[PDB]
Design a protein around this ligand. Structure first.
Ligand SMILES: *[C@@H]1O[C@H](CO)[C@@H](O[C@@H]2O[C@H](CO)[C@@H](O)[C@H](O)[C@H]2NC(C)=O)[C@H](O)[C@H]1NC(C)=O
Ligand SMILES: *[C@@H]1O[C@H](CO)[C@@H](O[C@@H]2O[C@H](CO)[C@@H](O)[C@H](O)[C@H]2NC(C)=O)[C@H](O)[C@H]1NC(C)=O
Ligand SMILES: *[C@@H]1O[C@H](CO)[C@@H](O)[C@H](O)[C@H]1NC(C)=O
Ligand SMILES: *[C@@H]1O[C@H](CO)[C@@H](O)[C@H](O)[C@H]1NC(C)=O
Ligand SMILES: *[C@@H]1O[C@H](CO)[C@@H](O)[C@H](O)[C@H]1NC(C)=O
Ligand SMILES: *[C@@H]1O[C@H](CO)[C@@H](O)[C@H](O)[C@H]1NC(C)=O
Ligand SMILES: [Cl-]
Ligand SMILES: [Cl-]
Ligand SMILES: [Cl-]
Ligand SMILES: [Cl-]
Ligand SMILES: [Cl-]
Ligand SMILES: [Cl-]
Ligand SMILES: [Cl-]
Ligand SMILES: [Cl-]
Ligand SMILES: [Cl-]
Ligand SMILES: [Cl-]
Lengths: 585, 585
């Protein structure tokens, strides 16, 4: 695919819509995330253009996947990232100097700095972007004012130059938000607040997933297939309120209500709808119709056709040669959902690259007894120490392509990264031979405030020398979201090889969380804190406390000190999220 | 359906496009003929509106088939006639006083009157509308100037008030044009002149039918299914030239070229595409999907769904329960035509009401021997005379719901219309009994210049007292088009009951045309003229010489005088087209 931009170039004619962006680089993000845009043309600040046309971001589509390039000064053009195998971010950390980004201003308070005003926007339910008047701003009245804004689109309605002011976006999509995510989904309930948009959805999960990526949507009501009024079946009503919460909880059958999870975006599927919808036909515009052997292959044909957004495989009785209908609409959704016409429908997987790789589905395997097997806990690594002899030293978790999360105390009297060897995808320690391949560590980042395990801060990152080619054997686990701080995890597991004594086959064990004060009562001498967590009723130093919640695995804890019944104490990973992100980029 | 307009009413929001029309009444025609418009809002001349918004005709669509009505002064709103069972005209005879209708001006010559300037526009290959500067127009230079115009749309690009000028449309769609229609369709031939538009068509007939109703299209090239370049299969290229003719005849296989038949519109199918296209899938936007027993019923489900423009029935092996896909696009055509996916496709018949009823298909029957049978020649009437006794007097042809075309000489010593009785749908004269129903004549319009049969002008209209409910038994025949003057008819027939001696069963006879000078040589004493035609090698006074050409029956002649081999002489109906239309409206 083509990621790089085009200096002084305009794509002639394929317009869908026009928005305002601070830069072409973010124009490209808008295009990538909009359901039809394939190419675009940003207009930079320039003498050769009037100020009203600056910051214009024209989203475009073409049947051929491209358009005519004509020369224009200060026109930056580009392609979307839909066509790409590399992952997709959505997080713009830029503070734009002298840029006044207009929207509906709704709070206007004082702030120490642009950084604090960004933290405020990010932590707010409504904020899309901010403008911060610096201390050098002439009007004393307006000096240090942090005004938060929102628009229909997430995009500013205008962009103008205004010296001594800095604008910037919300970092909710950088996993930096302290906002609580309400995952509670309310059956037989409707909400009646502001209806800002509507889509047709096959079910409420998809309805909620759509709410999450829609910038104006804070919560929703889905009117199900079995809903009485036919005109409203499969209707996903995207809603907002001035409070941020829904005004009232009206009971009603066959309807289903919930919240945006914008703040937990990085740990949830959002753009990745992988299910198939049986005896279901998605109505849209027809891209193509091809012979296909199964619904699964139909989805592939869609995924690999860039303009395709959803499909309906009509199965062949007769012979094995169904018809695969590749479809699209203006909004990524079907215009109508029919049941009872025998179709098998779903969506493009071309989207799942927009999702965090740690949210991809778990491969069904016969997790038998309490002995693990290949692929089962593929985030687990075994940390080897070359010195004295090559031996297992610690457990660790893949959380990145180049990053291991583990315990700081594992590195007591480790004088360089160069004695360390990280093995992935390992069942048996016995499997490890001299010829075996491993990742070498390049850097050990220990928390600068770490002293002792039983004190706080027992957390470490290994930056690997080479990156991991992800596989069923080797995959990352998600960090818990700062918004998920009150989630009650009830499916928690520890894994590792016993570390003293050690075992060969990777062991596994479902174990229960225990509350920080039920833990404190059973341990005195040093204080258990908010930055720790407990469980018990095993594994190694550095190993994961992995909790499964809503089909996704979370790295809730790192094994710190067992002391043993007295429960294991773990580093509370959630409390080190800023830190992990700060250090990893 | 709703035909009547709405005073001071605007339909809020469903905009497709915006054009300029002289009046709301013609706005309604534009809407009816545009492939998506269902409702609209015209803006009349008014103090309460600025002059730039006058004559605005906003074409609108709605998923529900209507929109919100809000009050506005000088906004006229209405619905299309798509929803209607009554026939549809397209012919606006209005001369708009003080109205300057802007377009590309291309000829600018002098003219005696507005009527003559309209006749000139009508007779011209390129003309959509005209403006005529009256003799009272101040600038002496511009006084009496008849300027012809065209636009992309057939619609003027602007409308402005300009005192002492009159504007008006072409009457090509009133069957008033003297322009020759080139029906010759050129196999393995392309044209290379100006490409003004393109559509996907299943075959070249449809391609040509689309050219005919497209105002900018004078001729076309169709690139067939078997065309080498896949990107251009089923491509219907709508073309024009400054000459009006195609520049050159480039040979090339699998391509097929032809002309607009705009001038012969009233005798040809144009909007009525009644065929089914097998192993053919029409791509468009999906309106609905329903269970259906056959392709024929699928077409019905489309026809009766007003937004549906075309369809694809996928047949059930298995059971009798296919899937009928109701579809639509922006232009009435499929966006792509796929072969080989097993679909049966075609178009809405909701269109055929736009076609002249005399173009509807002939019902297959076993036309046996030379004795007719029920339904065979359903335009034929038997003219009875009540006096002395009730007896067959003349043959006649239904050409309207309330009109019979026949011979002037039939009415020798007929003192009132009240002795006349018109019977339709009659095989046997014996079938006629006292209880039998008939149409009473209200008026006998004889050509004022008629003297004697063997002189000219032997033509008469019967205006009936009640109108004919059309049926397989009773249907009209088309007048020949003034543009079809050089058509060589080779499938001509006379029908009637022998009128002297007479027969009971309706007789039929294929007979050959004979040239006017091959006729003149075999008849002297009075002159055969351009306004007569001959045939021979039978029927009554007043009866039809019916010629079948391109699947359509034409009333080429009325039986005037046999004199018998010496051939029959007929009134040459083509030469009395202005007259028939003048008298019938
Ligand atoms: C605007 O936003 C700010 C911060 O999100 C709100 O300020 C807080 O108001 C509450 C209520 O007194 C206090 O407890 C907080 O200490 C305030 N914070 C700060 C930084 O002053 C403020 O109330 C909002 N006001 C409106 C309605 O615009
Ligand atoms: C404009 O249109 C008129 C009529 O359609 C053309 O006038 C005719 O020109 C030919 C060529 O000399 C004459 O034989 C006709 O007698 C003319 N008719 C009249 C009414 O004058 C005229 O040539 C066209 N001219 C252009 C190119 O604008
Ligand atoms: C556009 O710019 C390039 C780079 O200078 C030039 O070579 C080209 O001729 C320009 N215009 C075209 C191809 O129309
Ligand atoms: C490695 O694990 C497999 C799977 O259980 C086991 O059969 C085998 O015994 C182990 N290796 C050794 C040293 O036996
Ligand atoms: C629109 O006009 C009608 C006719 O006077 C009036 O009764 C009506 O109240 C007006 N407006 C509405 C219903 O919004
Ligand atoms: C009427 O026509 C039918 C059809 O040929 C014929 O059988 C019958 O003989 C006719 N009527 C009379 C008077 O026989
Ligand atoms: Cl400001
Ligand atoms: Cl559901
Ligand atoms: Cl398309
Ligand atoms: Cl494709
Ligand atoms: Cl989506
Ligand atoms: Cl003029
Ligand atoms: Cl063909
Ligand atoms: Cl639609
Ligand atoms: Cl419908
Ligand atoms: Cl059409």
């Amino acid at each position: 695919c083509v990621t790089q931009l085009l200096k002084d170039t305009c794509f002639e004619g394929g317009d869908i819509t026009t928005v305002f962006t601070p830069s072409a680089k973010y124009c490209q993000v808008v295009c990538t995330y909009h359901p039809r845009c394939l190419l675009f043309t940003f207009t930079a600040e320039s003498p050769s253009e009037d100020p009203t046309r600056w910051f214009t971001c024209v989203l475009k589509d073409s049947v051929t996947e491209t358009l005519p390039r004509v020369n224009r000064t200060a026109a930056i053009s580009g392609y979307s990232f839909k066509q790409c195998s590399h992952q997709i971010s959505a997080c713009n950390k830029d503070i734009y100097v002298d840029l006044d980004m207009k929207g509906i201003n709704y709070n206007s308070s004082v702030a120490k700095s642009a950084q604090e005003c960004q933290e405020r926007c990010t932590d707010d339910v409504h904020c899309h972007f901010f403008t911060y008047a610096t201390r050098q701003f002439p009007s004393l009245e307006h000096r240090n004012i942090c005004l938060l804004k929102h628009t229909q689109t997430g995009t500013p309605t205008r962009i103008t130059k205004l010296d001594k002011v800095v604008s910037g976006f919300s970092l909710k999509s950088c996993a930096l938000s302290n906002l609580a995510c309400i995952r509670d989904i309310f059956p037989n309930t409707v909400f009646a607040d502001s209806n800002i948009d509507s889509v047709m959805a096959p079910d409420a999960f998809v309805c909620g997933r759509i709410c999450t990526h829609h910038p104006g949507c804070l919560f929703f009501t889905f009117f199900s297939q079995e809903w009485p009024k036919e005109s409203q079946r499969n209707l996903c009503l995207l809603k907002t309120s001035e409070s941020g919460l829904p005004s009232t909880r009206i009971k009603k059958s066959k309807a289903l209500s919930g919240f945006s999870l914008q703040s937990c975006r990085h740990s949830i599927p959002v753009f990745c709808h992988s299910s198939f919808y049986h005896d279901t036909d998605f109505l849209g515009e027809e891209l193509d119709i091809v012979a296909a052997k199964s619904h699964e292959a139909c989805q592939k044909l869609c995924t690999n056709a860039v303009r395709c957004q959803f499909f309906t495989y009509t199965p062949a009785c007769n012979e094995g040669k169904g018809k695969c209908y590749l479809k699209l609409s203006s909004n990524g959704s079907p215009t109508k959902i029919l049941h009872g016409r025998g179709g098998i429908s779903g969506y493009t997987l071309r989207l799942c690259k927009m999702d965090n790789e740690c949210t991809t589905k778990i491969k069904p395997r016969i997790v038998g007894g309490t002995a693990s097997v290949r692929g089962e806990w593929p985030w687990q690594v075994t940390l080897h120490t070359t010195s004295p002899t090559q031996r297992h030293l610690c457990g660790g978790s893949i959380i990145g392509n180049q990053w291991i999360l583990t315990a700081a105390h594992c590195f007591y009297g480790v004088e360089s990264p160069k004695i360390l060897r990280v093995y992935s995808g390992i069942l048996n320690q016995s499997e490890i031979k001299e010829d075996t391949s491993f990742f070498g560590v390049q850097e050990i980042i220990i928390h600068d405030q770490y002293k002792m395990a039983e004190s706080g801060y027992d957390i470490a990152l290994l930056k690997l020398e080479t990156t991991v080619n992800y596989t069923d054997s080797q995959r990352p686990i998600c960090l818990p979201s700062k918004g998920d701080r009150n989630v009650i995890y009830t499916d928690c597991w520890v894994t590792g090889w016993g570390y003293d004594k050690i075992q060969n086959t990777l062991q596994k064990a479902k174990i229960p969380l225990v509350t920080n004060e039920e833990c404190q009562k059973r341990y005195r001498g040093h204080k258990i804190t908010h930055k720790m967590i407990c469980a018990g009723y095993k594994g190694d130093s550095g190993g994961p406390l992995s909790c499964k919640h809503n089909e996704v695995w979370h790295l809730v804890g790192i094994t710190s000190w067992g002391e043993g019944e007295r429960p294991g104490v773990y580093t509370n990973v959630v409390e080190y999220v800023d830190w992990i992100l700060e250090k990893t980029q």
